[PDB]
Amino acid sequence: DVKLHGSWVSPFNYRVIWALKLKGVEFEHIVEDLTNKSELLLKYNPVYKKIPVLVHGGKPIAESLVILEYIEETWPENPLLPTDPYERAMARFWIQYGATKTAAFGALFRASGEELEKAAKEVVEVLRVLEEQGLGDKKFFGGDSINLVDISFGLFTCWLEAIEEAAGVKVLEPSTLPRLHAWAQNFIEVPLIKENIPDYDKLLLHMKGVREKMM
């Protein structure tokens, strides 16, 4: 009844895997080869031709952030958003902030030397705003358990770790971002996340390849 056109490396696909598993929703995972996109992928997502694409009752939902809100509204038990409208607006605000700033991480795949150091310090500033104004002293962005905001920021854990290793730069460090680094460790230790993340060696090999092709 639920299908997910995905991948074993895309952080955007993993957001959807986490939300479905948090809801206890049974689904078929269909791994797409992005060099040979399926007929169903192109039919279901003609606008972007990207994964993830959730298909529920034969009807498709593309874009990870749109899919997450659909899952939250369709399976409302064990909520991943707060009930208060102001708190919900803050969650949407931070999710949107991450989506706009995710482009600044692309410079870690292209820049070198004194330019890559500049890109890394700009990423640290992006993360510091998120840490200071978004996370604060909470264990998770969701408070005492993960919510859609933690899910939207999960790419700053093993995916960012792999990018740091592939590029030879440090971004999310305990000395510079103490609370955000503790959060990244706590997020990765949540059993649902621990049991549903790509193998680090494979992810690192993928990131090295992306940096290789993007110079």
Ligand X SMILES: N[C@@H](CCC(=O)N[C@@H](CS)C(=O)NCC(=O)O)C(=O)O
Q: How far is CA 128 from the centre of its chain?
A: 18
Nearest to 19 by CA among 67, 89, 83, 90: 67
Cβ proximity to ligand X: between 16 and 146 the closer is 16
Cβ proximity to a copy of itself: between 101 and 211 the closer is 101
Q: Which does 97 bind (CB under 5 to 8 A by kind): ligand X, a copy of itself, none?
A: a copy of itself
Distance, CA of 27 to CA of 48 (rounded, Å):
23
Q: Is 41 annotated as a binding residue?
A: no
205 binds a copy of itself (CB under 8 A): no
Supply the minimum distance, in Å, between the C-beta of residue 72 and ligand X: 15
203 binds a copy of itself (CB under 8 A): no
Task: Tell me which amino acid residue 130 is.
Answer: L
8 binds a copy of itself (CB under 8 A): no
Residue choice 17, 20, 62, 123 for contact with a copy of itself (CB under 8 A): 62
Q: Which does 64 bind (CB under 5 to 8 A by kind): a copy of itself, ligand X, none?
A: ligand X
Nearest to 52 by CA among 73, 31, 21: 31
Nearest to 130 by CA among 161, 97, 173, 176: 97
Q: Is 59 annotated as a binding residue?
A: no
Supply the minimum distance, in Å, between the C-beta of residue 57 and a copy of itself: 8
Distance, CA of 201 to CA of 192 (rounded, Å):
20
Q: What are phi and psi of 176, to 5 degrees?
A: -95, -35
88 binds a copy of itself (CB under 8 A): yes
State how far the alpha carbon of 165 is from the alpha carbons of 24, 34, 98, 200, in Å: 34, 24, 21, 11
93 binds a copy of itself (CB under 8 A): yes
Q: What are phi and psi of 51, to 5 degrees?
A: -100, 155
144 binds a copy of itself (CB under 8 A): no
Q: Which residues bind a copy of itself (CB under 8 A)?
A: 46-47, 56, 59, 61-63, 65-67, 69-70, 73-74, 85-86, 88-89, 92-93, 96-97, 129, 133
